Structure formats: C-alpha cells, structure tokens
Amino acid sequence: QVQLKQSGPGLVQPSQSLSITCTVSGFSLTNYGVHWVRQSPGKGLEWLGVIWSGGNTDYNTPFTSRLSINKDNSKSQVFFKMNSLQSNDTAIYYCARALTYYDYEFAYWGQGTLVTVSAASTKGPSVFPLAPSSKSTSGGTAALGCLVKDYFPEPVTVSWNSGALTSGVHTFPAVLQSSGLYSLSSVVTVPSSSLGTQTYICNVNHKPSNTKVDKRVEPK
Amino acid sequence: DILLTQSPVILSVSPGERVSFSCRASQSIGTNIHWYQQRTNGSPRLLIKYASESISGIPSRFSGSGSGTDFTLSINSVESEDIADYYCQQNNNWPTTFGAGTKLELKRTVAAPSVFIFPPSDEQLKSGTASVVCLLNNFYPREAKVQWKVDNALQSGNSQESVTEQDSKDSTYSLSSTLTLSKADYEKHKVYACEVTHQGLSSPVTKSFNRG
C-alpha cells in the first residue's frame, strides 16, 4: 500500500534549523511529487512546498529563502529542511502525495511531525500509576490509569498492553504546568473481576527524550 | 492568495440528521476545490475532489456541490464517527490554500458522569510532590464543575483540567481534574474530596478518601 512515514517529533532551538525525513513506500519518487504541508495554531493548514519527480522544487512565497527540499530516489526518502525558526513556526509538519503526479489533491499523508520551537531543554516524563480501588469501582467496572508527569516537549504516546487493550481507553490532552513542563493522564475502564487475573500495563513513549517506560498498574 | 472562508466554525447536530458545510472563496475558482476530514490526533483525510467527484473508500453519505465562489460539503445522515474538523482547499490559483475549518459536534441524550478518585502513588510521594486525580467518565454535555476540598478547605488555583475530544463511538466526553500538592502539605491533612456537578445529576457527587 501507499505509505508516508516521517521521522520522530523533536525540539528545535530558536534561530536553529529544522530537519525531517519522509520515507515512502508503495510508489516510486521517480513517478510522484512529494508535497509538504504544516498546521499551526496561527495559520491552520498551509502549503509549504513540493519536490517533483524530476527533482524540481517549488517553495511557497514566504519560504523561498529558508526552505530546502531534497530527496534520494533509491532510498525512497525525501528530506525537508527549514532555516531560522521562530516560536510561531511551532506546528505539525506533514509530507503528502497527490492522486496524480501533477496534481494537488492530497490523498496520502505522512503521520506528521510535531515540531516545538523553544530554547528549553528536553525532559523525559515520570510515570505513576493511577491504582484501581473501591473508589474507582462502579457496578463491576473499575477505572485505572497512568499519570505521565513533567515532560517536554510534546508529544508522548500512550498505549495499553502493547495495543491489545483499546476499549474504554481515554488519553487526555496534555496541559502545560507553571514549571513549563507538560503533564497528562491516561485511563481505562475494565471489569473489576479481571484485576486478579489480567495484567495492565501502560506503554509510555516520549520520543524526544528517548524515554520508554512500561508501567504496570495494580490495586494497592 | 485566494482567501477561503468556512462558515460557521462550529456545527452541532443530532445523529441521522443531514448537515452542510460551507466554503466561500474570495474570488471565482470554478470547481477547483477539495474537502478534508481531520479526526482527533489524525492527519487530513481526502473526502471530495473537484467540488463533487467522489473518493475511493469514502462513504456515499459524503457529497459536495457548488461552483464559482460558493461551495457546500454535505452529509445526508450524520453518524457518531463523523465527529471531526472539515477543511476546504482551493487550487485554481497558486499557491493552493486551505480554509480555517469547521468543527462538527454531535448532540445526544444527557448522560451523568461516573466519578472516580485516585490518591497519589507512594512512588510520586518520594519525589516530594502529590498529585490527586479526579476522573469524570463518559458524560454529556461537556459542561461540568469540579471542586476540590482538603479537610473541608476549598482548594483554588492548584488544580488543572483536561477534557477529551468528543468520543466518536458514543458521543460523550471525559474530564480529568488533577490537584497538585507538595508532599508536606499532603501529609498534613486527611480527607480529600472532589465534588462534581453536572446536568445529569440530581445532586452533586462527592468521591473522597482518607490518607491512610
């Protein structure tokens, strides 16, 4: 199938440069152009540029002097590079492919790369259990979760039992604390009678700090 | 650049109802407009190309119309899974531009929240901080009040709230309120309570525990 897979999320210092790799499969770069689109709080969706099959590049007007797109046909990789970043360049950056080689209707997107522009340092999170008890139990159903505290920057991924548990999972949006670090909780409801025989693990992954933690949550 | 104006920013409807999204262009663009769906934590999904042409794998309930400056994306029978943001894109003029987007919220029956409270772990207490979490699960509508009390003292300014996006399966919301204390302050007190207020409750619900 047609897939676009972008490199991991990361922090970029003000005035420094941004670098993202788009690795594609299911088609050849010699046949299709790869587009680049970002999504900021300020300007929403915004077309940045494209590299065509022949290697030609078009950059949107405001980015013609600080944006560089390259590629490697044999490795099926596209390279995105932007210079002199400011705080409002903080956005999700996508690579994309159109329906046809020449067009602009984007049917295939990369998963996105959340880029944060700040002068701060990367910090990995601490993971604490939200233990189930009688005060998280309701009608044979128990709630339990993981507190993912004090990390920077966004994002963290959370899954449960390596993806085998998805029903009743809520992972809350991160909030920014006064410390300047983010914090987040992920909860799931399960039958209370399963707490004795099932193991529940939240899989926490903070790519910017390369922090991977599996936290087992159990009644206390 | 072409300016695309989507109106309104927010649409709220009941399931099974028909709904229409608007996209107006600052000048004529013929039928050179594409529509996108973006679900929570997702990338944009192509729905309609060139005003009305259908896309593979897209349900038949999605259709579009319009020409010139006035365009419309329609859903004949809206489902719970349609909860998302919708964007229009023009490409009659370089560079291609997108609208600001329209949000699709769904109505449903009033549902009271299940309230659960979680004391801090001993693990966190070792670091000198105590987080107490209050969970409001699967409720509607979104509006709720959470009030914290430590030994009958009303807390204020020391809690933070987070609300999930609308659930695409049952149209509910969930909310977490976290009370953050120092370990010392936490240890100097006994009764911890979050009182919850919501339309679905005939009286406030208080979940509480005693430290120890």
């Binding site: 999504q39 996105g112 | 973006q38 949000k103």
Partner: peptide, 10 residues
Amino acid sequence: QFDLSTRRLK
C-alpha cells in the same frame, strides 16, 4: 483555533 495537542479546532 487549531490545537497541536489533539489536532482539533478549539
């Protein structure tokens, strides 16, 4: 306004 945490307008 677009939110980077959920990818949803708020």
